Each structure stands twice: as structure tokens, then as C-alpha cells.
């Protein structure tokens, strides 16, 4: 508490050293994370550049298959569907947080028309699988980058809150307790002067 013994002062000094060492530990976690974040940022941008590459090839295949072959027949070959599902958000653990890491869809082992009755359409059905795969790669990189970036800025706001509050608040309480202890010491060295005055003013001049 703040009831001012001598022992509370020493416990506050111990608390002050705990806060001052925790500030340096928190800064060091943030710097190691920020090196990791500036590792991931280039990997996210190159996954999206690969996504742009696969994007231009897949939209080109789709434009060619709908231009040459009919719109209605590509609607008919695309309404006949593989089961379309299979994605799942499995567990990742990053600095005190589970995040969803997606895995692939995988009905691509089961594809329609083993004799591909259109030709350019089946190139588009091969194209958009590579497209969706680069899509889920970009997804389960960017979600990690989101969580690392906001964890970091959380640490900075916890650092600045902890520093600018519990360093000056604790130093204020320490100066308060040092003041009241010095004052009681001052009262004691008043009462000692009174005892010495009353012992000398009897046993030096009585009778």
C-alpha cells in the first residue's frame, strides 16, 4: 500500500526497478518483432506480384475461352460443379494469438469432362485453380502480417502507457514516502534536544 513505513519505500524502489527493466524488455521484443515484420513485408509483396502474374494469365484464358467458345456453353460447363469446398482455417500461434491459416480447396483431383469437349474452357478451369491457390497463399501471408503489425503497435502503446504513467506515478509516491520519513526523523531530533535540555537544566543548575 501507500501507508508510509520504511519498508514500503524499499518495496516501491523494487517496484520501480521492475518497471524500468520491463520497459527495456518490451522495447527489445518490439525490435525483434519489427525485424520479423520487415522480413514478412517483402514476402507479402512478392506473393502479390506472383498473384498479379497468375492474374493476367488467368483472365487472358477466360477472355479467350468466352470470346471464341460461347458464353452459354461456358455457363453450362461451369454450372456443372465440383464440390467447391474443402478449405479450412487451421491453427497458428503467433506471440499470444491463434490466427487462421487456410489450407487449399482440393476438389481438383475430381475434374469434369475427361474428354474435354471445349478446349479453351478447360484451360481456364486449369487457370483459375492456380489463381485460387495464389489467392489463398496471399491470404495466409497477409493475415500474419496484419497480426504482427497490430501486436507491435499494441506493444508500443503499452510501453508508452506504462512508462509515462507508472514511472512518474511511482517516483511521485517514492518522493512522498521519503518526505514523511524525513519529517518523522526531524521530530525525533527535536525531542532529543528537549530531553537533553531538560536533563541539563536540572542536573547542571538545580539548587
Amino acid at each position: 500500500q501507500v501507508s508510509p513505513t520504511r519498508m514500503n519505500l524499499l518495496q516501491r524502489r523494487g517496484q520501480l526497478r521492475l518497471a524500468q527493466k520491463g520497459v527495456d524488455l518490451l522495447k527489445k521484443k518490439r525490435d525483434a518483432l519489427v525485424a520479423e515484420f520487415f522480413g514478412l513485408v517483402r514476402e507479402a509483396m512478392e506473393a502479390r506480384k506472383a498473384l498479379d502474374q497468375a492474374a493476367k494469365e488467368a483472365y487472358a484464358a477466360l477472355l479467350l475461352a468466352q470470346a471464341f467458345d460461347g458464353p452459354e456453353v461456358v455457363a453450362g460447363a461451369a454450372l456443372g460443379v465440383p464440390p467447391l469446398e474443402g478449405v479450412e482455417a487451421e491453427v497458428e500461434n503467433v506471440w499470444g494469438s491463434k490466427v487462421p491459416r487456410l489450407k487449399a480447396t482440393f476438389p481438383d483431383g475430381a475434374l469434369l469432362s475427361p474428354v474435354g469437349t471445349p478446349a479453351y474452357t478447360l484451360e481456364a478451369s486449369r487457370a483459375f485453380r492456380r489463381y485460387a491457390e495464389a489467392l489463398i497463399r496471399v491470404a495466409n501471408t497477409e493475415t500474419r502480417l496484419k497480426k504482427i503489425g497490430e501486436e507491435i503497435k499494441k506493444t508500443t502503446r503499452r510501453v508508452n502507457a506504462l512508462e509515462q504513467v507508472v514511472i512518474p506515478g511511482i517516483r511521485a509516491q517514492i518522493r512522498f514516502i521519503q518526505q514523511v520519513l524525513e519529517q518523522r526523523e526531524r521530530e525525533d531530533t527535536f525531542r532529543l534536544k528537549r530531553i537533553k535540555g531538560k536533563i541539563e537544566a536540572r542536573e547542571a543548575e538545580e539548587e
Binding site: 488467368a58 478449405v87 482455417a89 480447396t105 489463381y131 489463398i136 491470404a139 493475415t143 503497435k153
Partner: protein, 104 residues
Amino acid sequence: MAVIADPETAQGFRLAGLEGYGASSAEEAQSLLETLVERGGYALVAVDEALLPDPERAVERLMRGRDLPVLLPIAGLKEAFQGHDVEGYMRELVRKTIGFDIKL
């Protein structure tokens, strides 16, 4: 999964075996976004840049928790002649993320 860009875009995804939607206007894009959010679809949603630039809004209003339908501001093909300006997207991302835009 699911995407929204355009019907011409979405039929390619439906040809992939992936659920597509398509809206001409941005409000209808948030309408279809709201549709697949309420009908919680397998956890992934891609959204074209031309309709919604930063489509976090519907899931941060509705599914504030659990982080589950992962959003992606994907690029559209009439704009993919330009190629999204991937570097500018990354600058915008780090400035949104940790506030401090610098040069890599």
C-alpha cells in the same frame, strides 16, 4: 470461399469450383458482402478493388470477433492492365498498419 467482382469475373471463379458473386455498384457489393457474411461461407472472401477498396467494414461491424471470413482487396481485370500498383498498395498497407510510412 467466395469472391465478388463482376458477373464476367465471377463466372471464371465458378468455373474454378469457387463461389462467385458480382455487383455493379459499391453499395450492392457491400450488399453481397453482407449476404455471404450472414451466410457464413467457408472462411474466405475476395473483393475487387474497384468496388470496395478496403472491405474490412462489414466484418468489423458484424463479425468483430473470430477474424474468420478473411477479406482480400483483389485486383480487377480491366484495371489489371495496370497491375494494382503493388508497391503503392504495400506503402498504403504499412501506413495503415503501423502508421509510419517509410521507404523500402
